[PDB]
Structures are given as C-alpha cells and as structure tokens.
Amino acid sequence: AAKDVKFGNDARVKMLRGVNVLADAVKVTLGPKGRNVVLDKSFGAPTITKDGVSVAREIELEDKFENMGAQMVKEVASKANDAAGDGTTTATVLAQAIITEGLKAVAAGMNPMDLKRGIDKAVTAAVEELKALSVPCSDSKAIAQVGTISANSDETVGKLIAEAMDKVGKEGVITVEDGTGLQDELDVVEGMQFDRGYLSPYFINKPETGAVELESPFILLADKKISNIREMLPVLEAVAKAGKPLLIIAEDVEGEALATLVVNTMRGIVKVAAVKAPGFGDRRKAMLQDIATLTGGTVISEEIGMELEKATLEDLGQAKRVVINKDTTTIIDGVGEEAAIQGRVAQIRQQIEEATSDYDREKLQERVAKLAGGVAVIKVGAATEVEMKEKKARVEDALHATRAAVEEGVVAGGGVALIRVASKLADLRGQNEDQNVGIKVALRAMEAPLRQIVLNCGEEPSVVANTVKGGDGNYGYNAATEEYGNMIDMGILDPTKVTRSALQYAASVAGLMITTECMVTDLP
Amino acid sequence: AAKDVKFGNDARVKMLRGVNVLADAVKVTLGPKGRNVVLDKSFGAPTITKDGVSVAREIELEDKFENMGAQMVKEVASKANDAAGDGTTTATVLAQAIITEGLKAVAAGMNPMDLKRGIDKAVTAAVEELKALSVPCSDSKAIAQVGTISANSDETVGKLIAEAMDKVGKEGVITVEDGTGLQDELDVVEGMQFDRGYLSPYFINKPETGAVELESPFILLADKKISNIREMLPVLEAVAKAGKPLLIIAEDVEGEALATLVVNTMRGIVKVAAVKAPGFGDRRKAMLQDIATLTGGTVISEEIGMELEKATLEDLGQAKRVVINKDTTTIIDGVGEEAAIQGRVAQIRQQIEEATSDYDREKLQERVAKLAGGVAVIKVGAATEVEMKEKKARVEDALHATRAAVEEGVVAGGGVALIRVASKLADLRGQNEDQNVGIKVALRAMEAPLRQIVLNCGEEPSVVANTVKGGDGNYGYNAATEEYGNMIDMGILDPTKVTRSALQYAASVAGLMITTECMVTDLP
Amino acid sequence: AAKDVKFGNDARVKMLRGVNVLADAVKVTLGPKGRNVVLDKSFGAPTITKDGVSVAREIELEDKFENMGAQMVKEVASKANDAAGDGTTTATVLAQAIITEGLKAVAAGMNPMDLKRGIDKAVTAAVEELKALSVPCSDSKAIAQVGTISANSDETVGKLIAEAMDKVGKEGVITVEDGTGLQDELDVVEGMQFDRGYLSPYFINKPETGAVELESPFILLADKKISNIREMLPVLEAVAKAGKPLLIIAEDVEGEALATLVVNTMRGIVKVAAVKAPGFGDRRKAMLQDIATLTGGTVISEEIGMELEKATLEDLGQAKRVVINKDTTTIIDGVGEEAAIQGRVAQIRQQIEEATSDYDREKLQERVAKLAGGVAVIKVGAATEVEMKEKKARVEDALHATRAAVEEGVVAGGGVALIRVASKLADLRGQNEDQNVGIKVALRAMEAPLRQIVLNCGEEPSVVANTVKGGDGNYGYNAATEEYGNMIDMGILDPTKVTRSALQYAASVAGLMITTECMVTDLP
Numbered sequence A, B, C: 001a002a003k004d005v006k007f008g009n010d011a012r013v014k015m016l017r018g019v020n021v022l023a024d025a026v027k028v029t030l031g032p033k034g035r036n037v038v039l040d041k042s043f044g045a046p047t048i049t050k051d052g053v054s055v056a057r058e059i060e061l062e063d064k065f066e067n068m069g070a071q072m073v074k075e076v077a078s079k080a081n082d083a084a085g086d087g088t089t090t091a092t093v094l095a096q097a098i099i100t101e102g103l104k105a106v107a108a109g110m111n112p113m114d115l116k117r118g119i120d121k122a123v124t125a126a127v128e129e130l131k132a133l134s135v136p137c138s139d140s141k142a143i144a145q146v147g148t149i150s151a152n153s154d155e156t157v158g159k160l161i162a163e164a165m166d167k168v169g170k171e172g173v174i175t176v177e178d179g180t181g182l183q184d185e186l187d188v189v190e191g192m193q194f195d196r197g198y199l200s201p202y203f204i205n206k207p208e209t210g211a212v213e214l215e216s217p218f219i220l221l222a223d224k225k226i227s228n229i230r231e232m233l234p235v236l237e238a239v240a241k242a243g244k245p246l247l248i249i250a251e252d253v254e255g256e257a258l259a260t261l262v263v264n265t266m267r268g269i270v271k272v273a274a275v276k277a278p279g280f281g282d283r284r285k286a287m288l289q290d291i292a293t294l295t296g297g298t299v300i301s302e303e304i305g306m307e308l309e310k311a312t313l314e315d316l317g318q319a320k321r322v323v324i325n326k327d328t329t330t331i332i333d334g335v336g337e338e339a340a341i342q343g344r345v346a347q348i349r350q351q352i353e354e355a356t357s358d359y360d361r362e363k364l365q366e367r368v369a370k371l372a373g374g375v376a377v378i379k380v381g382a383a384t385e386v387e388m389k390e391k392k393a394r395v396e397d398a399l400h401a402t403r404a405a406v407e408e409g410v411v412a413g414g415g416v417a418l419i420r421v422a423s424k425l426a427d428l429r430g431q432n433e434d435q436n437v438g439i440k441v442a443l444r445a446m447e448a449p450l451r452q453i454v455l456n457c458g459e460e461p462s463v464v465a466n467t468v469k470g471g472d473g474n475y476g477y478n479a480a481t482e483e484y485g486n487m488i489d490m491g492i493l494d495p496t497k498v499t500r501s502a503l504q505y506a507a508s509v510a511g512l513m514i515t516t517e518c519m520v521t522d523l524p
C-alpha cells in the first residue's frame, strides 16, 4: 500500500487541527451547564447526548493526518474511562490545553524532549500535591454522603452502598442486578471476581455498559490454550441442548476458536463468552481450581490426559449470573456445597503457615478474600417497572464514584482541585529554560477544566478563574446556582482517583504528541 | 466510517432548516380548513392524505444535518400519537414555534440552559392551568356527546360506546371488530389486556390500528427468556397442523428466537406474535398464571424443570382474537372453563382480605379488574360491506377520543385552550432575564396552533387571534363556519389529554434542540 | 446611472461588515499601549502612525454597500475631531459597540425606532451624569496642571498657557506661531477671531492640522456674493506685485469664482483662501467694517455704488498671519491703527449705551469682545528647527486640551468616566421592553473604550473592567504602568468635553444606522 509522509511543522498542524475537532466536540458537554451534542444514526432518529465518551467514540475525520491526531487523544478519553469511569471530558479538555500550548512552544523553537520532561515533572508533583488536598472517606457515614450526591440527592441509594460495604468490606466485591419486586434486597452469595477481561469486544450484549451479561451460564474450565475449535465442539454441542449460555475460562482462546465463537454468538447461535485465566503459571493452576470448586465444575488440562473431546457436563461449572468488564470478570452465586468451598478455603489456610516467604503470603490472602469473602447482590425495588430500571443505573453510577472515594478519596470539585494545585506549584522549576516553560504549560492547562465549565455557564471564564485563585482552600464556583462558596459544603466533589487519572493520561498523550516529528498514513 | 462535524451556530441553522421542512409539510393539514398533501409511491397512484402522521413519516431530507433536525421533531409527532392518537399535527406546529423563537434567542446571545428551564417551567404551569380549564366527563350522558361529535355527528356511534362503558366500566377494556350482519352487537367475553405491545414492528399486518390482529389464535405461556428457536420448533410446526396463528408471551423474546419468528410470519409460513409478560419478578409469575387459566393452557417455568420441547397443543391456551398495539395487547374469548376462571376469582378473593402489607391490596384489585372485570366486544353491522367497513372505522375514530375524555377530560377546541392559558400566565417569571424570555417563547408558541388553523381558513391569523384574546372563557373561532362563539356549545372540543401531550412533547424536544452545540453525522 | 438596491437584514449586514473594518483598523490604536497602523502611499515610503484620524481617513472599501457603512461612522470620527480635536478613536470604538449590539437586537426582532429612543435617552442621561462627575478647572494653578500632563510632563508648556490665559482671559483668543530665537515670547497684539470655515477644503496648505495658513496676507472685504472673475481680475492682478497671499471675505463665493480660486491655487499661481462673511443681514455689514478697521483696508458693496472693478491695493486689508480650520477663521496681528481701533471701540461701546433690546445688546457685547479682546500669541523657543517643531506640536494639542478643560472640565481618564456612568444608570428604564434593551445596549457600549485599552495592554479586558466596577469613584486602571489607583492623582485625565462629544456623536450615527432599512448605491 502506497503511503503519504509528512514532516515536522507541516505534520504537527494536522494533529492540532485533528485534536481540536475532537476536543471542541467534547468540551461543550462539560459541567452541569453543559450543552447537548447530537449524533446521527443511519437507522431512524438521531441520538441526543451529553456523555463525553459517546461523543468521542463517534469522531473520525476525513483528512487521514487530522484523523490520526483526533484518534490519538480519543485513546486517552477511553482509557480514563477504563481507570475510573468518570472524568473523560475532563481528560480531553486537559489534553487539548497541554497540546495547544505545548505545540506553540515547539513552533517557537524549543526542545520537545525538554518540554515533555517539564510537563511530566509538573504532573508527578501535581499528583503528589493532589494526595495532600484529598479528604479521605473512612467511616461508613461519610461513605453514605458520596453515594447520595452522585445519585442526584437520593438517600435510598447511599444507604444501600453503605450496607453493602459493611458486609463484604472496602475491598469486597459488590454487584447490582434487576430487582424482584418492590423493596431493595441485599444478600451475600458465594462468588468471585478476578482481574481479566473479555477475549474480544464483540462478546458484548449490553447496549450501553460494554459488558457481557449471561443468565444461568455453564462454565468450562481449561488449563491449556485453545487454538482449533475442533476440541470445543462436543462440549459446545451439549450446551446448545438446554439453551443456556457458555463461559470459557482458559489460559487462552485465541486464533481460530475465538473467531468461530464470535461468528456464532453474533449470528445468534448460542450465547458464549471467552476469558483469559487470572494470573500466570503456578499461581494460575491454583486459582482456576479455586473457581472450579466454587463454581462446581472440573478443570481440564492436557497434563493428566483429560481432553475436551471427552468432556461431559459435570466438568462444566454452573453460576447464577456472570458479568464481564473490559478488564474484569465476575461471578454471582455458583453451585458448590458450603463445605466444598470452605474446605478449599482451609486448604489455603494451611498454606499460610507452611510456606515461609514475603510475596508468597500475599497471594494466598488475596485468594481467600475473593473466595470466602463473598459477593454482594443488591436487587433494586420500585412499583412500576420503568421506575426500577431507572433506579438501577442510578445506583451503578453512584457506586463507581464511591469505589474511587474509598481508594484515593475525594477532592474539591468544580475543577478547583487542579486550579488550587496550579497556584501551589508556581515555584516549580526544571533544569533548563525549555523545561521551565514545559511546567508552565502544564500549570496553565490545569486552569482549563474550570474555565470550560464557566464558559458553558455563560459567564466569562477569565473573571471567575481569577476570583477562585484569589481565595484559598476549597473555595470555588458553583455553575448550577451561579454562586461562590465552599465546594465540599455545597456537595460538589470529585473522587481524587478520577482527577488523578484525567490529568496523568492527558499528559501522557500530549507528551507523545509533542515529541512527534514524522507521520505515516495511507494515501487518499 | 468517516464523519462530518458541525459546531454552534453553523450546526443549529441546519436543524432549523430541517425542522422547517417537516413542520411546513405538516402544518398545512391542520384544522378542518386543512389542505391535502400528496405522497408519492413507486407502485402506481400517489396517496392524497390530510393525516399529519402519514405526512411526517415520509419526510427524510438529503442534507444529513437537515435530516437530523427533521427526524428529531418527527420522533415527537409519533410519540404524541403513542400517548393519545390525536394531536400529532398540533404537536408539530408547537414544536416549530418553540424552536424557531428559541433559536432566535440563542443567536441573540442568551443561555440555552436558562431558555430550556424557562420553557419547561412555563409548560409545567400550563399543564397545571389546563387541568383547571378542563370540563370532566363523568356521567354516561356526557360521554355519549363526545363519541357523537368525534364520529361526524353520528348518534349510533356514541350510543354504543356509552353502552360498552356501562358494562365493563370506565377502566374496562373495549374492543371493536367486524360485524356479522345488519345490527350492532355487544357481548362481554372472557378476556384480558396488559401493558405490553409487539416486541418488533415487523409483526404488523394491517397498519390501520397500527397493530397485530389474529383470528382464532393459539397462545403459549412461558416464564423464561427465549434464547434460541431450537426450542420453539416442536411447538411452532405443531400449530401448523390444523393451521392457525400463534401468540407468544414470554419473559422476553430475544436474539435468534426473535429474528427467525419475524422472518417466518413475514414470509407467511405460520403467523406468530411476540409480546412480553406484564409486570415483573414475583407478580410476573402471578399475572401470567391468570392468563393460563383464562386461556385454558399451561405455564412453562425456570424453577420447576419444564422445557419447550415437550409441550403439545393441549398445553396451549386459545382465543377468538388478539389485538396488539405498540404499548398494548388485548385478548378476546378464553376457552378456559367457566369454573376454573372463577376458581382464580376465589384465589385472589382470599388474597385481598388476607393481606398484611398495604400495597398488595392495590395491585391485586388491578388483577381481578383484568380477570373478572371483563372485555367488551362491539360488532358493527350494516347491509353493504362497504358501509360495514366505513361504520366500523367510525367507531374506533370515536373511541380513542372518548377514552381521553374520561381520563383527563375535554378542553375548549380550536386551539383556544392553549391561547387561553397564554393570557393567564403573562405574570409568570423565572430567575434571570434569560429564563424570562424562555417563558415568553413558550407562551407565544401556544398561539401558533390557532393561528395556523386560521391561516388555512384564508383569514388573517393576527386579526382572529387578537379577537379571541379580547373575549374571555370558551369563546373561540369556528373555522368551518367562519363564525365566532362558544366552542363547547358548537361541539368543537379537544380531549385535555391530547392537548397536554401535544404541548409537553413539543417542549421536550425543543428543549433538547435548543441546548444543541455539536452535531456528528456520516459523510456525504 | 444604474443602481443597486438592498433591503432589510441583507442591507444591514453589509453596513456592520463595513463599519467593522473601519473600527478594527482604528480601535487597535487606542490608549498608550496602542499599536501602529501602516498606511501605504504611492510615492516612496509608507506612513507609520497611531493617529486614529489619519487611519480613519484612509479607509474606503471595495463593496459599495460595505463602503457606505464604513464611510458613515467615518463621518463621526471626523466630527468628533471638529468638536474637540481629541477622542476620535474613543468615538469610533463606542459607535461600533452601539451598532454591533444594536443590530443584534434588530435581528432578534425588536423595533429600531424604540431602540434609537432608548439609546438617546440613555445618552442624554449620561451627559447629565458626566457633568456631575466633572472636576472643573477654575484657577490658573489647576489650569497649569492640565497643560503639563498633556505635553508629556513638560512644565515649560503649562507655564506659557497659564500666562497667556492670564492676559486675554478664559474666553480670549490664543495662537501659537514659530519662535524668533532661544526664549519663549508672549505679546498681546491687536487681532480678532470669528466663527466661519473655509469655502474649499483644497485651500488647506498644512494638512497635518487640516488648516489654511498665509504669512503677511492681503484681505478683500465685500458684502456681495462673488460669481464672476470679471469683477475679480484687477484685484488679483495686483496681488503678484508685492508677492504675498490673499484672503477673500465676501458674502459668499460661488460656482465660478470658487472653482477659479480653488484650482488656481493648486498651480501655485497666487496662494489664496475664501471664507464666508461672519453673521447675517444687518449685523453682517458692521462686522465686516470691524475687520476692515482691524486690518486697515476698506469694504466694497453694490449698495453704496462701489464696484469690484476699481478695487486697489489700499482697499485691501493686511494682517501678519491668517489661519482657517474646517469651521474657524482667525486673523492675527492685523496692521490697523492705534487711533482707528480705539476709535471704533469707543464707538461700539456707545451703541450699547443706546441699546434698545435685550438681544441687540448681547451681539454688540460679543462684537467688542472680539475686536478689543485682541489675540494672544506664543512664540515657542528651543535649540534648532527640530525641537522647535516638536515643542510647537505638543503645545497646539495641549492648548486644545486646556481649552476643553476650561469650558466643561476634566473627568477621570482611562475610559473609567464612562464605565462609572454605566453603573450609575443601571436603574434607567424606557417605556416598553424594546426601549429598555436600547438603554442596556448603550450602557454596555460605555464599557468598550476601557476594555479596548486593556486589550492593547495584553491583559484580559473582562478581568480589569470587573475590578474597576467593584471599586468606586476615580479608581481605574493605568495601562502604561499596569497599576491600579486614583486616575486624577496619576495624571490620567480626559477633558469632559471630549468624552461628551465622543459619546454623543457615536450614538447619533448608530441611531441613524439602526433605523436603516434600505440602501441605494451605484452598480459595480
């Protein structure tokens, strides 16, 4: 394929032009005074949304070089979403502000490599300063406050989360599913969650969540890599019988057997999912047999001689419900006797004392907490059906925020956290003049999130940002009420984790983009 | 796919241009002095119609951005149709008037978010003012008056509706079907109606009721989500013996199970209809069993161990007819024993009296109201079939209006109801100047429906609207006779429900469209 | 000639586009942080200047309609210059801000005639409020302060003005000419100044002032309108003998006599100029004899029997310098007599002893105030013809500032005077909503001069204007030092007259331009 190549200044202006389209399409949806962005669909009515992720996903430009620019900063928005779930628009407004001001310096005739190091040092210092500004959420009374304001002043939502975290702990696994009737239910059932995602994106069946949800799915467990589907068939054929989906945990299922499972599921023939096993090597083999007893199935490995050809349904585990993130797989209520699991539990409790090491201890406790710790199931209750399904997603986006509120804490919202960090790093310097500007680029980029919220509110961003900088602490601007004051007292707050993710990722890409000299793409 | 993105003022003018096409094509058919709109078809003769829905459906513009605008306000027209069945043209004329005047303010330099809140507050106040202006229809003598004038001064139509409502009640289920002979018949047969419509559009046979219609159909009842059709087959091709259509009521009907049922009804090879089971969860199973008894069939569940691959024709329920709208499904004549149905009467009669929880008593009544409350059936008769048809249609074209006349009442027609509300909300104010204009935009939009009817009548709208505002009460303009007077006395009236729907929906979309800053569509 | 005609919105956007070119070309030169504008000349080097008048004069657009717009606001800049000599840029920045915001309202759908009345009422109130904010200059100590700061902190300049005003008075006539040597000289010589302009703008020899100037000149005086040169030859033929310029003061100079003298001075064959006879009718005939006695010549009129043919050298009058503005003739050091002037005065003062009417008195008083009041003359003195020309240049301009400082006073500079008036008229209302916006347009236009100065200074105008509004009084922003403080104490001040002229004129044109619906121009 014939290629087009652009160099230097010529190449960069095409990126800036490209990112500016994606940014300006997203930055308009920032804050509560945000604007609607309409996205066209071929089938019927257009989609009107404020969700910065949905808008970002749709952007793809005509000019191949511009497209690259745009597609580069898009990779950040989506990754910020993967880290926290929040702050995708806040990431993108930052990224733009670093790139626009960054490239200005490069064009002025400054060393890009010194500019990158200036930005990254300013960021590493900003993350460090941010941890100091963070107000932790320890007790289950302050945890309830975060879940309430995140779900639009709903006290019923925050009460459930606090009760769920009081059962499984702060490290425990909490999941939300559809309710049975009129009252919110809460049970702790035997389940497990491990840190591996879906094997391919086309496994999804949730129109919005980007998730794979399977009701009463049988579980196949394979220690060996599956290349050909020629081995899976005898199992797969018995899973079509008694039409219930299939979950494949293995070392790997990649190459041929994956694509044939993608062709099938999407065509409609049997709902299936594939997921890489947790961990690696010797500690994997154990974890898998842990799932196996908990899910009531049996492991199949080439090591003893058990091949998938001769694999009936007892080898297959049963679970009540499974959910698969982009980066996580989780199970709810597997079959497996009270004893059967708690028996395997003690078989790891012995291993705590028998093996004398530093690292070997951790893995055993991170296994027993997944397995004997349990899983929290909150079933939402309302009167009419559409009042339940609306109260469902409300809890889900009020949980993700609470999760981040526990791990790193909550900083002052309204983009004031960053603008407060900015004034506290004014004395920060690099090694040479070029690095010094690199810092000032990053510090002037931290003002942009606030400035963008004010712009949507109709007020002059310059005036408001200047007033917030003059006052000290958690004093900021409420765009909803057009009133100044203490942000924490006004319920305006952002989880520290989301703001840390938004800044770090946005700097990471800008750093790579500032050091760009050559672009190679396909010919129009 | 490469995308085109437009921002701000540039993006909005394409919407306005787009909505103006759909609006101007529809607003010409308003009132009785309305004009004909001709719609082209590839096969043979063009369709000449005044129906604002039929005209709206056909509009789809070339310019992708314009198309979006047009397709946005179309959603409303169709949704107003879903709420009432009337006032689709009245909705669209309103929507245009809010958008055109709204965007004018945005372009002047006013906050869209404040303009939206100004409109919505003016609307919430207008709905509240509308309820006060409403004249209720309580007794069955005033109910007969509404059915008479809605069917073009036909007294035979209004008499049947009043007799039907005197049998099953105001909450009762009333259905119209083809007559047997020369006299109008009225029986109450064992049937039920639940708040679930067709699961896919492609089930529609005749697009007049906008519904599925099945003669002598079997019914299947199962409390499970249908994965694959490799479960249905032994039943589907069992109903094909003796040759009759089938009804499918399952938790859901998704995936391959859905699409292959679609392909089989469409191509003719046995006609089936997929509808959800009503309510949810625990009273999902309960409300479904009610139907099983009513139909003389059986239930196939998840807990017990009953699968589809062993249900004979005996295991199926049966009916004389089923009517399936978008949000509705109603059954007629259940082959179930006269005692077995009455046995479930006692099985709910024991539940009401023995209820510790205060909520059950409410919905248990809403179970016997659909079971022992009944279903009324009117068979319209004449000497010629060409007047059996024409008279059959005249009853349904009077029932939908009577339904709304009972639920919320009837206001003064001629678009005077809204113009009367307009003068009564002149003192309404918001929080800032921008919100204040948002209200005045909505109030000047309420004048448009009347103004549009007068425009079709050839008279100057400005003069007539000014005369109607000067006088008070139910004093309006009769466009048919070119005479002023009391609207109620002249038989010109609109169901409160339709006018409330027309205003609310039209404001809802305008609100979303005013807050639009970015549009993303496919490249030409 | 074939014409092009544009109507309404189409016609207005061409004006706005047109004024925006002239405004943006001038507004960049506002304040002391102003930018340079380069003007091209066909002959040699381009002219680099900051003078808002020189820039305005040069603007003339290609698009005939755009040109009209631009040429309309240009008429104001030049007229502000005619009133004060200062504030031409400040006028233009105001005019733009009223037009831009004005037309926005017209396009929104508001009555132009109500918008004009709203602006004019806001202005009449602003001029009234401005008189209250003015700090008068009464004593000759505070008069010296104004002449010092206007001439770039030069105390020698301010000392001369104060000494000149102590001789002839505040109403007295003061003129500046070239010096003889090394010290500044000050004499009071027998002269007079009256209020008429030149008949041709092509008589102007020194364009920098925009004025006519003749050394040791001859003078004609005639109570008759001159139309033919056949009456003029034997006069003009005598002028080349004794090589010196000529000044005609006749009733009027018409058609031929005009076009003769205008072109026949371009050639360089006899420099001349012609101005209208001061006053009218009866008071016309005397004022001329005054001049004749003042100069030492004689008058010539058809009334008595005096023809223009036998007008010799002695019938002509002699001064030592005559200066003519757009609207200001001034005869300096007329070689009359001791006994003739003292005689004519003691005669005119006897007329007021026999004063019959209140008014007849006044115009007689004002007539000796001219004749017996004399003219003060200042001969600037410095080393070489480089600092002599420069000092004279700072004097002329500062005198002009001191003149206005006496008549109306001095307000607080930095454009704060207007922005202070703006906050004090916030409660001002009109008769209807459209008039109310007309006022708010004018009040937001008063902020622009300050905002434009800050823009040139590089600082954000929004931030600075917001800070000036918060504080009260003569507290403003110094753009030269980037410091806030009391403007009067910092020497930053504007003569009230100039700010009054700048506002009134800018509103006058904007008012006319807002009420424009049709434009007629020549075809391209």
Ligand SMILES: Nc1ncnc2c1ncn2[C@@H]1O[C@H](COP(=O)(O)OP(=O)(O)OP(O)(O)=S)[C@@H](O)[C@H]1O
Residues within 6 Å of the ligand: A029, A030, A031, A032, A034, A050, A051, A052, A053, A085, A086, A087, A088, A089, A090, A091, A412, A413, A414, A415, A453, A477, A478, A479, A480, A481, A492, A493, A494
């Ligand atoms: N009342 C408020 N006033 C000012 N800022 C607010 C207010 N409420 C929330 N915010 C800020 O809103 C910002 C978040 O904007 P969002 O619209 O959530 O975009 P995002 O989080 O970047 O991405 P999405 O769209 O959530 S996936 C947070 O940083 C809050 O500080």
Ligand SMILES: Nc1ncnc2c1ncn2[C@@H]1O[C@H](COP(=O)(O)OP(=O)(O)OP(O)(O)=S)[C@@H](O)[C@H]1O
Residues within 6 Å of the ligand: B029, B030, B031, B032, B034, B050, B051, B052, B053, B085, B086, B087, B088, B089, B090, B091, B412, B413, B414, B415, B453, B477, B478, B479, B480, B481, B492, B493, B494
């Ligand atoms: N004689 C009349 N004079 C004035 N208005 C009338 C008269 N008769 C009916 N109307 C008004 O006609 C309006 C309804 O217009 P329609 O043409 O029915 O449009 P629509 O109801 O919005 O949608 P369709 O076309 O019925 S689906 C009602 O609001 C009546 O108030």
Ligand SMILES: Nc1ncnc2c1ncn2[C@@H]1O[C@H](COP(=O)(O)OP(=O)(O)OP(O)(O)=S)[C@@H](O)[C@H]1O
Residues within 6 Å of the ligand: C029, C030, C031, C032, C034, C050, C051, C052, C053, C085, C086, C087, C088, C089, C090, C091, C412, C413, C414, C415, C453, C477, C478, C479, C480, C481, C492, C493, C494
């Ligand atoms: N140090 C200063 N800081 C801020 N404003 C100043 C300062 N010095 C002068 N000004 C303002 O400068 C404004 C005048 O700008 P100029 O450049 O003189 O334009 P103008 O007077 O409109 O027209 P010209 O160019 O003089 S004919 C006055 O209103 C002063 O208030």
Ligand SMILES: [Mg+2]
Residues within 6 Å of the ligand: A086, A087, A088
């Ligand atoms: Mg967010």
Ligand SMILES: [Mg+2]
Residues within 6 Å of the ligand: B086, B087
């Ligand atoms: Mg209708």
Ligand SMILES: [Mg+2]
Residues within 6 Å of the ligand: C086, C087
């Ligand atoms: Mg000046």
Ligand SMILES: [Tl+]
Residues within 6 Å of the ligand: A029, A030, A031, A034, A050, A051, A052, A089
């Ligand atoms: Tl957003």
Ligand SMILES: [Tl+]
Residues within 6 Å of the ligand: A216, A217, A218, A244, A317, A318, A319
């Ligand atoms: Tl299972």
Ligand SMILES: [Tl+]
Residues within 6 Å of the ligand: A457, A458, A459, A482, B111, B114
């Ligand atoms: Tl606002």
Ligand SMILES: [Tl+]
Residues within 6 Å of the ligand: B029, B030, B031, B034, B050, B051, B052, B089
């Ligand atoms: Tl219609």
Ligand SMILES: [Tl+]
Residues within 6 Å of the ligand: B216, B217, B218, B244, B318, B319
């Ligand atoms: Tl049947």
Ligand SMILES: [Tl+]
Residues within 6 Å of the ligand: B457, B458, B459, B482
């Ligand atoms: Tl008519």
Ligand SMILES: [Tl+]
Residues within 6 Å of the ligand: C029, C030, C031, C034, C050, C051, C052, C089
């Ligand atoms: Tl200037």
Ligand SMILES: [Tl+]
Residues within 6 Å of the ligand: C131, C132, C133, C134, C135, C136, C409
């Ligand atoms: Tl004063």
Ligand SMILES: [Tl+]
Residues within 6 Å of the ligand: C216, C217, C218, C244, C317, C318, C319
């Ligand atoms: Tl002379």
Ligand SMILES: [Tl+]
Residues within 6 Å of the ligand: C457, C458, C459, C482
């Ligand atoms: Tl500066």
